[PDB]
């Protein structure tokens, strides 16, 4: 009886820090809903070179990572984006199929294609170009 | 009044699921025999360098072969007179001199003496008795010194034909057959939001939140340390709080109404 | 010929604004100040030498205050000191 | 409880060492109270030194310093 | 009895298997295993984290209930008078740990 | 040079953090003294001064006087459990004693 | 040249050098004068000798060659000047002086 | 580890005053404590004397005065005598 831990509020207080970080745990950053709204509504319409900021990026917002398999996580993000976006946007939030294992399968399917063959770094390229050499692929980071 | 706990049912209790070991040592050599049978250019070893679980396998399959934490541990026994060093899941979490390859709280590798032995365990348990290409994951906007040190360990220590770095969430995007969207990926170290426009990541404006599953575990440990205030007779590890979070936490839909009437007696 | 008079006066006119204090009483209060100073400083020095440190940090002063002053006195003193050091750091 | 481990016989012996011929039955509980107050004072200081030193173990030196602080200097330890 | 455990310790080992592919010419450098502060000091990317500016709903930090008012002595958000009682008689050294769990402890230096 | 802000103020204090620092440093308590130490010690000295002077003014009002004197300081230092424990082996000049007559000596 | 200890130069068994170091490194003063450790070593040696002499006598009286804590207690409490110097001091395994108050005897 | 003590010198003095007598480890601990305690007392009082009279040096004269304040009666006279002998031998050599 003494060796028992009861959980009441910790069920809904701990996975809530993703949405209200500055109040529950004091991390002085923004919530997930507010970051998604900042990107969808204030940066992407102001970026030249793309056609439709709400009509394209809202077609597929899906959730990938391991810290996602909580009950009712996509619905919270959908209600937040529904509160932020204009009325009539075809919002459809879904998730990946194998959330903790698709990060491996995507690089498994990518590994032996022509873009990957055009993005490798061989040994003599490491001997010549140096150490911090970046083949600019559309998935990797920015070249330097 | 005896009513509020007279007809109350007996409790349904759940035990502790601590991340222990598991009784398996496979020296799997049946993958190299299939890898040497394929034509060249279509054989590569893919390593997901995850902060919670480094995964590794061959590209022509669907499940990864090795899925281990970056835990290693080295010892010296004077009662036996021998130096031990095993790594991965073979550590039991009875002895623990555990240090991790990832820095606690950030998915940037800065403990290279651990990462070298982790990669050593990977290449041993895959089977290397002798030169395949390597596709390896990293974090978003990685520091250049970490990439330099990782490339130096790949070329100089082991000897590899080629390696290429990529972002694992974007690989899971490309496997999920998307073209243009908003990838939100909550990892073990940080939660990234990355806009992708026609199979191209717009990394000039992606934003990472500094919260993750490790922060879930540590904050859960702090709240169970401060809830049970007068002293709890029990070892409060971080990993058992992580397994509490994995199966006893859910994001509530309407938080400010659910929260204020949560600790009522009725129910 | 330096004395904590000035400061005793400023504190007095903060806590009982229209009340004065006599010259003899000022002497006694100054002696009080010197005595408490000495005791705390000395206990702090001892704690330092005992822990093989060569510096009297805020943490030495805190522990000295907790050893010297009784009960509520100790608690309130710790509080005030902590508040002061915090404000100093902020500025 | 544990204070009642300071038994009536133990207190008798200490009174005998001090030259006491006859002991009223009320002395035993008074002695326990007096002892508890003394130990609390010394242990409070000993723990205070222990905490300062960033230790979890109370040492002989912490007790010796606590006793010297209170004017009851102990020779034989340290 | 402990022979099975000893065999499990012996077979789970890296030095028991010879490294048939490690290059012995390579030598490790000492100046590794740094921190993020040190690596950022070397290069003076990863500054795309963004703060917020919005009203925050302040909850309790003893319990998880919504709490509307704090204290002068200890600066703790608290729900009602039971939690106020447990705040004003808690043993010392923990009233700072609640602000440590919430953040902005500001420990002395 | 930028304007000289007194440390007492930088601290929100009436007491002289400056002098306290001199006395700790020039006073051989140790080889090195932090800034924190002066600040904290000055604060603690102010607090106890405040308590004593407050109780003393309370006593002075109780006796309808405007001026704190030694007897007042003494009666203050003796009516508080905590100050009397802090100053239990201190003699205050011109302080006198607290009024006390045993029961057995009182008229019966 | 050959080293001559300040102890031997002063005619003392007690360590003048060690005492000098302890006076410097114990934060007692900014400066420690050359005569100070010699004087302090002389005094500590004297008082050491005085207690050990009386303790040796106490040991002899109990027909033992080893000074045990009991002998230090008997040595200290039977000399008025030691008992005034060490009045507030407790000695482990020292015991008490044999002393029954006059009115308790039959 | 390393833990220096006065046990050596205590033993040297013992074998001058009573050659046939020995000393137990517990008694040696007490003697080690005693030397430390009276060192701290005399050095401490000499420190105060120096500070009071606005002097920065614990000279022989401070130690002498400290000894007169701390030791009772004949112990003061004898201690002051041996100290005066010691500094005389030292300075004359
Ligand atoms: N069934 C589940 N329910 C909830 N959470 C889970 C479940 N299974 C795993 N998790 C969480 O997923 C996390 C592991 O995520 P994962 O290992 O994919 O991140 P990662 O890819 O290593 O991160 P990074 O890319 O930063 O290295 C763990 O914190 C665990 O809490």
From Swiss-Prot, chain C:
<feature type="modified residue" description="PolyADP-ribosyl glutamic acid">
    <location>
        <position position="2"/>
    </location>
</feature>
<feature type="modified residue" description="N6-(2-hydroxyisobutyryl)lysine; alternate">
    <location>
        <position position="52"/>
    </location>
</feature>
<feature type="modified residue" description="N6-succinyllysine; alternate">
    <location>
        <position position="87"/>
    </location>
</feature>
<dbReference type="GO" id="GO:0042802">
    <property type="term" value="F:identical protein binding"/>
</dbReference>
<dbReference type="GO" id="GO:0019731">
    <property type="term" value="P:antibacterial humoral response"/>
</dbReference>
<feature type="modified residue" description="Omega-N-methylarginine">
    <location>
        <position position="59"/>
    </location>
</feature>
<feature type="modified residue" description="N6-acetyllysine; alternate">
    <location>
        <position position="52"/>
    </location>
</feature>
<dbReference type="GO" id="GO:0005654">
    <property type="term" value="C:nucleoplasm"/>
</dbReference>
<feature type="modified residue" description="N6-malonyllysine; alternate">
    <location>
        <position position="83"/>
    </location>
</feature>
<feature type="modified residue" description="N6-(beta-hydroxybutyryl)lysine; alternate">
    <location>
        <position position="1"/>
    </location>
</feature>
<feature type="modified residue" description="N6-glutaryllysine; alternate">
    <location>
        <position position="13"/>
    </location>
</feature>
<keyword id="KW-0238">DNA-binding</keyword>
<feature type="modified residue" description="N6-(2-hydroxyisobutyryl)lysine; alternate">
    <location>
        <position position="10"/>
    </location>
</feature>
<keyword id="KW-0379">Hydroxylation</keyword>
<feature type="modified residue" description="N6-glutaryllysine; alternate">
    <location>
        <position position="75"/>
    </location>
</feature>
<feature type="modified residue" description="N6-lactoyllysine; alternate">
    <location>
        <position position="83"/>
    </location>
</feature>
<keyword id="KW-0044">Antibiotic</keyword>
<feature type="modified residue" description="N6-succinyllysine; alternate">
    <location>
        <position position="1"/>
    </location>
</feature>
<feature type="modified residue" description="Omega-N-methylarginine">
    <location>
        <position position="53"/>
    </location>
</feature>
<feature type="modified residue" description="N6-(2-hydroxyisobutyryl)lysine; alternate">
    <location>
        <position position="83"/>
    </location>
</feature>
<feature type="modified residue" description="N6-(beta-hydroxybutyryl)lysine; alternate">
    <location>
        <position position="87"/>
    </location>
</feature>
<feature type="modified residue" description="N6-glutaryllysine; alternate">
    <location>
        <position position="83"/>
    </location>
</feature>
Swiss-Prot record, chain D:
<feature type="cross-link" description="Glycyl lysine isopeptide (Lys-Gly) (interchain with G-Cter in ubiquitin); alternate">
    <location>
        <position position="68"/>
    </location>
</feature>
<keyword id="KW-0160">Chromosomal rearrangement</keyword>
<dbReference type="GO" id="GO:0000786">
    <property type="term" value="C:nucleosome"/>
</dbReference>
<feature type="modified residue" description="N6-(2-hydroxyisobutyryl)lysine; alternate">
    <location>
        <position position="68"/>
    </location>
</feature>
<keyword id="KW-0225">Disease variant</keyword>
<dbReference type="GO" id="GO:0005634">
    <property type="term" value="C:nucleus"/>
</dbReference>
<feature type="modified residue" description="Phosphotyrosine">
    <location>
        <position position="65"/>
    </location>
</feature>
<keyword id="KW-0544">Nucleosome core</keyword>
<feature type="modified residue" description="Phosphotyrosine">
    <location>
        <position position="28"/>
    </location>
</feature>
<feature type="modified residue" description="N6-lactoyllysine; alternate">
    <location>
        <position position="68"/>
    </location>
</feature>
<dbReference type="GO" id="GO:0030527">
    <property type="term" value="F:structural constituent of chromatin"/>
</dbReference>
<feature type="modified residue" description="N6-acetyllysine; alternate">
    <location>
        <position position="68"/>
    </location>
</feature>
<feature type="modified residue" description="N6-succinyllysine; alternate">
    <location>
        <position position="68"/>
    </location>
</feature>
<feature type="modified residue" description="N6-butyryllysine; alternate">
    <location>
        <position position="56"/>
    </location>
</feature>
<dbReference type="GO" id="GO:0000781">
    <property type="term" value="C:chromosome, telomeric region"/>
</dbReference>
<dbReference type="GO" id="GO:0070062">
    <property type="term" value="C:extracellular exosome"/>
</dbReference>
<dbReference type="GO" id="GO:0032200">
    <property type="term" value="P:telomere organization"/>
</dbReference>
<feature type="modified residue" description="N6-propionyllysine; alternate">
    <location>
        <position position="54"/>
    </location>
</feature>
<feature type="modified residue" description="N6-glutaryllysine; alternate">
    <location>
        <position position="68"/>
    </location>
</feature>
<feature type="modified residue" description="N6-succinyllysine; alternate">
    <location>
        <position position="54"/>
    </location>
</feature>
<feature type="modified residue" description="N6-(2-hydroxyisobutyryl)lysine; alternate">
    <location>
        <position position="21"/>
    </location>
</feature>
<feature type="cross-link" description="Glycyl lysine isopeptide (Lys-Gly) (interchain with G-Cter in SUMO2); alternate">
    <location>
        <position position="36"/>
    </location>
</feature>
């Amino acid at each position: 009886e003494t060796h028992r831990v009861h959980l009441n509020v910790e069920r809904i207080r701990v996975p809530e820090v993703l949405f209200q970080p500055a109040a529950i745990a004091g991390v002085d950053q923004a919530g997930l809903v507010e970051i998604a709204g900042d990107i969808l509504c204030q940066r992407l319409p102001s970026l030249p070179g793309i056609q439709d900021a709400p009509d394209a990026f809202l077609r597929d917002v899906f959730l990938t990572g391991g810290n996602t398999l909580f009950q009712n996580f996509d619905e919270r993000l959908r209600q937040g984006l529904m509160a932020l976006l204009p009325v009539g946007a075809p919002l459809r939030v879904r998730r990946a199929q194998d959330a903790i294992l698709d990060a491996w399968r995507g690089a498994a399917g990518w590994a032996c294609t022509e873009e990957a063959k055009a993005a490798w770094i061989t040994r003599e390229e490491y001997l010549e170009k140096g150490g911090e050499y970046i083949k600019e692929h559309d998935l990797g980071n920015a070249f330097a | 009044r005896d009513e509020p706990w007279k007809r109350l049912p007996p409790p349904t209790v759940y035990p502790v699921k601590e991340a222990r070991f598991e009784k398996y040592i496979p020296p799997q050599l049946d993958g190299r025999e299939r890898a040497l049978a394929q034509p060249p250019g279509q054989v590569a070893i893919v390593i997901d360098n995850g902060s919670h679980s480094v995964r590794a396998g061959w590209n022509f399959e669907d499940k990864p072969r090795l899925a281990i934490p970056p835990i290693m541990s080295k010892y010296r026994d004077r009662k036996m007179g021998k130096t031990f060093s095993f790594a991965g899941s073979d550590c039991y979490a009875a002895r623990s001199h555990i240090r991790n390859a990832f820095e606690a709280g950030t998915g940037i590798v800065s403990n290279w003496d651990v990462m070298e032995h982790v990669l050593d365990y990977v290449f041993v348990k895959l089977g290397m008795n002798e030169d395949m290409p390597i596709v390896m994951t990293e974090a978003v906007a990685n520091l250049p010194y970490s990439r330099k040190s990782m490339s130096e360990i790949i070329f100089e220590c082991y000897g590899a034909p080629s390696l290429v770095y990529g972002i694992d969430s974007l690989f899971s995007f490309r496997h999920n057959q998307g073209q243009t969207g908003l990838v939100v990926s909550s990892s073990y170290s940080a939660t990234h939001v990355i806009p992708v426009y026609n199979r191209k990541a717009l990394l000039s404006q992606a934003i990472r939140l500094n919260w993750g599953g490790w922060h879930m575990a540590e904050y859960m440990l702090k709240l169970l340390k401060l809830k049970y205030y007068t002293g709890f007779p029990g070892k409060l590890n971080s990993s058992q709080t992580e397994h509490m979070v994995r199966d006893f936490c859910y994001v509530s839909l309407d938080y400010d109404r659910e929260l204020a009437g949560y600790l009522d007696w009725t129910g | 010929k330096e004395s904590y008079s000035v400061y005793v006066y400023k504190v007095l006119k903060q806590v009982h604004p229209d009340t004065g204090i006599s010259s003899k009483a000022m002497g006694i209060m100054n002696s009080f100040v010197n005595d408490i100073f000495e005791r705390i400083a000395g206990e702090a020095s001892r704690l330092a030498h005992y822990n093989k440190r060569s510096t009297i940090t805020s943490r030495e002063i805190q522990t000295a205050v907790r050893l010297l002053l009784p009960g509520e006195l100790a608690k309130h003193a710790v509080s005030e000191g902590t508040k002061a050091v915090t404000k100093y750091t902020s500025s | 409880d544990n204070i009642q481990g300071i038994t009536k016989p133990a207190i008798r012996r200490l009174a005998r060492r001090g030259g006491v011929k006859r002991i009223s039955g009320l002395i035993y509980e008074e002695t326990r109270g007096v002892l508890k107050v003394f130990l609390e004072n010394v242990i409070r200081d000993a723990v205070t030194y222990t905490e300062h030193a960033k230790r979890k173990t109370v040492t002989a030196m912490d007790v010796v310093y606590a006793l010297k602080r209170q004017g009851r200097t102990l020779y034989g330890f340290g | 009895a402990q022979a099975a455990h000893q065999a499990l310790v012996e077979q789970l080992d890296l030095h028991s298997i010879h490294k048939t592919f490690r290059n012995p010419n390579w030598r490790p450098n000492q100046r590794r295993n740094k921190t993020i502060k040190a690596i950022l000091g070397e290069s003076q990317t990863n500054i795309e984290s963004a703060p917020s500016l919005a009203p925050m709903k302040h909850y309790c930090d003893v319990t998880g209930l919504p709490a509307p008012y704090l204290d002068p002595k200890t600066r703790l958000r608290y729900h009602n008078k039971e939690i106020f009682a447990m705040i004003r008689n808690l043993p010392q050294g923990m009233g700072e740990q609640f602000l440590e769990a919430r953040g902005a402890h500001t420990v002395l230096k | 040079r930028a304007k000289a802000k007194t440390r007492s103020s930088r601290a929100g204090l009436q007491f002289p953090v400056g002098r306290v620092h001199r006395l700790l440093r020039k006073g051989n308590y140790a080889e090195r003294v932090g800034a924190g130490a002066p600040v904290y010690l000055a604060a603690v000295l102010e607090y106890l001064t405040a308590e004593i002077l407050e109780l003393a003014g309370n006593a002075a009002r109780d006796n309808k006087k405007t001026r704190i004197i030694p007897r007042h300081l003494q009666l203050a230092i003796r009516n508080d459990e905590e100050l009397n424990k802090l100053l239990g082996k201190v003699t205050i000049a011109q302080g006198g004693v607290l009024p006390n007559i045993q029961a057995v000596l009182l008229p019966k």
